[PDB]
């Protein structure tokens, strides 16, 4: 979905949405496109093990340094293991081959609970299918300005370090959710931002997002 996201971002940015006589950003809001999933917490222990994270439904996962992923559902028992080549297996906490990674996941779990806030804690996620499988973390990287997190459902999340603003890009709905410095949040359809425009801050973050999606595609 990265190629689609790149096309959507190229389109919104070419419209120069902040270079307008009157920006009407509010008219581009569409609260129904709020995501089902985003990353609420993360821990970069890549010096040793990998990147642990929590999704907004309170499930957790780890992308290990060997590019494998282990996800624990919010039921506290169900696991999905994803190999480097993408092969998926469904297991429970209740194989010996995964004992070490399960232990690491629990420790990441505990650390996130002990030390970190839940991003978007005040946001009601969109309701989807209670029985659907969780997305997992495909890859991530850190720049001067942000951490970039790409989920297997196509979503790309960019969390900015300086002001704690966050972008969640959802290419299936061609939408973006923006969490601002005050933790207020809005969801926009990118096509409506073309129509109505947006402020320089959001325009800058959307240019930055396209740069990040290009980096993801280059990786």
């Amino acid at each position: 979905h990265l190629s689609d996201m790149l096309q959507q971002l190229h389109s919104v940015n070419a419209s120069k949405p902040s270079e307008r006589g009157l920006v009407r950003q509010e008219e581009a809001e569409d609260p129904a496109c709020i995501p089902i999933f985003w990353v609420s917490k993360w821990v970069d222990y890549s010096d040793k093990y990998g990147l642990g994270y929590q999704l907004c439904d309170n499930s957790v996962g780890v992308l290990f340094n060997d590019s494998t992923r282990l996800i624990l559902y919010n039921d506290g028992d169900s696991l999905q293991y994803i190999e480097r080549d993408g092969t998926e297996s469904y297991l429970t906490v209740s194989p010996n081959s995964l004992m070490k990674k399960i232990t690491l996941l629990k420790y990441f779990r505990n650390y996130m609970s002990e030390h970190l806030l839940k991003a978007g804690a005040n946001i009601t996620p969109r309701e989807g299918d209670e029985l659907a499988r969780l997305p997992y973390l495909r890859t991530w990287f850190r720049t001067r300005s942000a951490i970039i997190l790409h989920l297997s459902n196509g979503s790309v999340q960019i969390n900015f370090f300086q002001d704690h603003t966050k972008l969640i890009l959802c290419p299936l709905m061609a939408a973006v959710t923006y969490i601002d410095e005050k933790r207020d949040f809005r969801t926009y359809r990118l096509s409506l931002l073309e129509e109505y425009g947006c402020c320089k801050e959001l325009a800058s973050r959307l240019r930055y997002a396209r740069t990040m999606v290009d980096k993801l595609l280059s990786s």
Binding site: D44, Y45, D47, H115, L117, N159
Partner: peptide, 5 residues
């Protein structure tokens, strides 16, 4: 380790 807020 580095981490979120």
């Amino acid at each position: 380790p580095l981490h979120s807020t």
